[PDB]
Amino acid sequence: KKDIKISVVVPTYNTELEGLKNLMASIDKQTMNPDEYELVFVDDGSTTDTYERLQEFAETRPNMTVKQIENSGWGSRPRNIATKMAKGEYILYLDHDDTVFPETFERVYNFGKENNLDVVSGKEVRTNGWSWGWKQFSENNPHAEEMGIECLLPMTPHKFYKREFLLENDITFDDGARVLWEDVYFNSKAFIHGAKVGILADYPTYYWIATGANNSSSFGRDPHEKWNQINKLFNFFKDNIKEQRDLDFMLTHWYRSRVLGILGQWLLKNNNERIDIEFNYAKKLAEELIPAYISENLDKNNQVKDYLLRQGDLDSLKKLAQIDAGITALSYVEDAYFKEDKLFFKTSTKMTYEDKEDFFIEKTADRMERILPEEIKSKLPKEFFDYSDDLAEFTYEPSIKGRNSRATWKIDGSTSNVEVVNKKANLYKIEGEMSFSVQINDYILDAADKKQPWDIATRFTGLGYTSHRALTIGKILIKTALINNKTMIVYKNASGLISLDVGSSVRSIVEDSGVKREQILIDKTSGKVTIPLNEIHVFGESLIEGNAELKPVGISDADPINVKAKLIGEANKARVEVLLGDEKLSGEYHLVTNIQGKKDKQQIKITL
């Protein structure tokens, strides 16, 4: 019949139909025609009656196929079996707790088909954090495998894989024994077999939801199992990745992230029993599997960690974790205002311990050094605590997050400046300033994005530290704008962080702007009541439909009178027109406007 573009494989196990409502809805709302994709659910031997109800459900959907296998224990064998019965050109591994954005299938397929891609690595979104794949999802790239294996990071399985490519190269998930980071093996095997990879960065494709339920299995908490799994992963890299630059990247990335990653604040969150266990494991892994040259790919602080790890100097690493504890960079709002159709920010930041006192580096002779106790300084190669060659590698960038979609984006076009300032004696602090503007239409991709609160954040990097935190301000900030049929309010939110409310999802634009009460005009021939807004930045033409409620003054149990109202922006002024029209009214009346589902508390009263 008609060729299938996309096969969505979803493993299940004791999965109630109610737990699939959001998933099924996100698939049903795909712009792609439903006879061009298929769903392949494979049940991992459920013991309850959830499989029966799944098969009954699938009887009403011709593009949905449902199968059950003997219980294997995890979703690898369900994914593999679903893959062998899929018919689509591309396969998406969609976990049943996750959802897909409405234009994903169309955009991903068109991108993969036009560029003959074997893997489409689409922008993935996560519930928490201010970024995901910040480096890799930076621009669309149809030839991303030219960058080497890093084009597949983050190595989740939530990409679109060309089915014939998986089958031709026998790329499958491991279903013989549970392994950690199974998706890292899967994506590595794809790259090793010469996959053409494309990165689709301009549209969120996949939403990996954080459920809050814990994988509280003894398998994932066993420290001996953990380091057995890390040994297996590094031996997999060394045995199978032949291109030197790809092997060295994987060895560096994973040594830094999961091996040296236990040598910082992890040392302050664990007891000596588990520290000694995991530390001895890491020392053995560095010696046996990690070439000594890898350490030259690392930043200064990681070179110190690698050095002391190989020395077995756990006591110094513990002391260094105490000295490093709390280093951060939080941005303060210096200025915020609307100009034309955009919102402008001036921000400032400096490196601190937990937004308190200054973080310092020390100038000795002609080199800027890390402030360390003399016992540790004399134990290290001198270059490792010399920041001199790193004082020009600071970055300071802004970012935004949709509070409903959870999509995160870099705000482009910013200018920033980071200075190393001599505070006192030979101590130097790190100060930064940034200017940027927000054109909210750059981030409105789905219709739901038009009414959303947006949260603003800054990303500061330098000296090996990365601080991506929300933008904040201390004083109360409330500023409003009416820009080309968009209500916009920038404000200090309830957590003390900077937000932009578009579409009255959180705040009332009438209440936040104020009402020139003495400038209210009543036209008794047309029934129009004009209510001009006080403090608001108006750009372009705007007409927001709403309504208003009238109740007579004095009557306690008065019945409301509902009429149509309009928020109008023209000639850089804003007003609410309440259309009484033909209604017969007399006396004084309360007036409460209801624009975009928010009511004002301006105590407006009119007399007819």
Added chain:
Amino acid sequence: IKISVVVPTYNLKNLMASIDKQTMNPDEYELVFVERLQEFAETRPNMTVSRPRNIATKMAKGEYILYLDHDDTVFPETFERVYNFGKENNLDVVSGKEVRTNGWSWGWKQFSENNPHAEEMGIECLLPMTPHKFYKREFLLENDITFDDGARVLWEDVYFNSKAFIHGAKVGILADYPTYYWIATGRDPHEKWNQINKLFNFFKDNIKEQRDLDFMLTHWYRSRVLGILGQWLLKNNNERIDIEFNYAKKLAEELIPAYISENLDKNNQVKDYLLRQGDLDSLKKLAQIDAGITALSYVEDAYFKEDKLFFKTSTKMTYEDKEDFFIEKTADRMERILPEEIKSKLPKEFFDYSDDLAEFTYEPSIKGRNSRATWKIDGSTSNVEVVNKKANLYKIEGEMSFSVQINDYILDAADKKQPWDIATRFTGLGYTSHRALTIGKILIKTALINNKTMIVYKNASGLISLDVGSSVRSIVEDSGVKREQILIDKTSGKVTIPLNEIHVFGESLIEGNAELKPVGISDADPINVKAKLIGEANKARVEVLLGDEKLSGEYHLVTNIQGKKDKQQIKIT
């Protein structure tokens, strides 16, 4: 009889727990209660089982009377200290230092130094006017001073103390010992402002000396009338605001003379002017502009030296300890930053801070976490500077140095072993920020000074705490142990465990113990063994004494000094 404890009857042993532990002779004080109540009194030789408080006042036979409340406690040496202070100075009222659960101060200005003749300072001496003072019974009956009857009026203790002073009360302040701990466990808007009118009318009708009237008017107009023109406006609905604002307007016009505004700071003169105008819209906006102004002190350096703990702190006026608080220079005056829509409505000098830039204060304080008593750290040095940051914007920055001698605050035996919390108090431009001293980096420093273990540290909240006596933390743990430096003598049965980093000063001998478990075997019964913490000649060490059991091999040695075990992984061969 020396002291009579009046108690408003309400539903007993809880109330008597703090009373029975008084150092004064129990037959020198009595307790006045006004079927189980008979059973309780007949077994006590000193018990005698607003209107009930007046009856108990007449019938008491003690020289002084304390009006104790439920849940409120009294420190174990209060009775004998207050009586000797009053009788020797022939005092009619003893305004002893009062302790409250939360906050970093209470009676900061009044409880700063003892004053046996404090009545000469004016009516200000009785602040705070809580009913928790000691009143001479012969003076109360002489001037017929009683609690107001016939109505549940608010600020009853304000009337009571004002009646005492206006009758020439001989009052003295006892600030060197905490006397009364107040636990404290009319919301209708028309009732509130009816009661506020009563209090102000009581001032103008009964206070005869002008110096005391102007103070009481000022202190109460500032705190309870203008007190609703700040952050209060941001925490109430428009209906409630409109009601109380019109009451406050009426009370200012009808009862508060104009010359009271001259005694107010700039920001309070602004609120007074706009209140009398009825400009509620501007007071609302001003409340948004003022919100969050504070001054938090960071720690710049902290270290022990000799027998004291030294601190170096810094602060800056901020909004919520984020961006800087600014003031603006226009011509030759430092103006408060305001919108021109409000600047023009105001008398131009009410937002000019020029004459106030020499009045910044910056002082440190301490507080006991268990006793909840607060003290000012005597002998501090501080400096405040108005610095131009950019363009004509000026910020307010300060620095301070001080030291802590923990013996200055040890009064009860329970103070020897309790945590302490350090704080700073920064006033200026009408604002007052008394907040905990904070630090961002991990700070852990130890000391063994004259049989006192001391640990200054950043606690889980990021605030500076001082643990004296291993009440929360282990001295051995935070000091460190050099396992590569242990000394073991099997003949004498003595294991010498030195301490890594610690400030030792004087001679110290803390009696402790330890525990031994064989290295390898995991379910052997624990062997408890006595030990000692020794501090001598600028060095500390723990000496364990073993020679009652036989042992050979590797053992786990866990110290237990003052009930705090270490986690230093000590193994002995």
